[PDB]
Amino acid sequence: GDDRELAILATAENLLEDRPLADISVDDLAKGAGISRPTFYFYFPSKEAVLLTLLDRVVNQADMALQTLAENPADTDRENMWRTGINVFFETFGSHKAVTRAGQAARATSVEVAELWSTFMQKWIAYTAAVIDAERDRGAAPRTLPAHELATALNLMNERTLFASFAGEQPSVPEARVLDTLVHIWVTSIYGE
């Protein structure tokens, strides 16, 4: 039951490593999961819907991991606090590069994917803003930009930069340099005048 579903999900993720959604048939998804095409259609209405669920689970994994971090303060300086946070996204999406890459393209096409991404981005920006605001209240950050606007630009940087880097786009920050790069820009822009 759940097992066939899990196998369709895993077959899909596997197949997205080597080629795009376009050049993957539900036929390929069925065989890989060891089921018929009709049986596939019982678990998912489409191949697009397989991607969506896959993306859903990556996004929830990131979020949950961020919630875990937020609940257990790490005994460290401001720079490592931010780093530890950004690293959740770096590791989680970096561990699911094929889904990441396919998700982001599907944003153009699928309203569900666009809305899924949109919902979580807003949540992560709201959280970034609350932390900046909290840093301003304790007197550790200067009151420069509207915290929420700053959080927005910083989150959008991370999205574009993390993903160009995982795709190996030209141009991009080398994947082994991208954490330090993003952390420097977060902390200088959050704490600097």
Ligand X SMILES: CC1CCN(C(=O)NCc2ccco2)CC1
Look at residue 164 and give the partner it binds from ligand X, its own copies, none, a contact being a CB closer than 5 to 8 Å depending on partner kind: its own copies
Residue whose token pair is 């999961």: 33
Q: Which residue is nearest to ligand X (CB)?
A: 158
Residue whose token pair is 């993903």: 163
State the nearest-atom distance from the C-beta of 193 to its own copies, in Å.
Answer: 8
Q: Is 47 exposed, middle or buried (0-12, 13-18, 19+ CB in 10 A)?
A: buried
Site for ligand X, rule CB under 6 A: 85-86, 89, 93, 124, 127-128, 155, 158-159, 162
Between residue 103 and residue 162, which ones bind its own copies under the rule CB under 8 A? Answer: 105, 108, 118, 121-122, 125, 144-146, 149-150, 152-157, 159-161
Q: H-type helices in 72-193, by residue range?
A: 78-94, 97-109, 111-137, 147-167, 175-191
Look at residue 89 and give the partner it binds from its own copies, ligand X, none, a contact being a CB closer than 5 to 8 Å depending on partner kind: ligand X
Half-sphere CA count of 70, side-chain side, radius 13 A: 12
The alpha-carbon radius of gyration of the chain (Å, integer) is 19
Measured distance CA(56)–CA(46) in Å, rounded: 15
Look at residue 128 and give the partner it binds from its own copies, ligand X, none, a contact being a CB closer than 5 to 8 Å depending on partner kind: ligand X
Binding site for its own copies (CB under 8 A): 105, 108, 118, 121-122, 125, 144-146, 149-150, 152-157, 159-161, 164, 169-174, 177-178, 180-182, 184-185, 188-189, 191-193
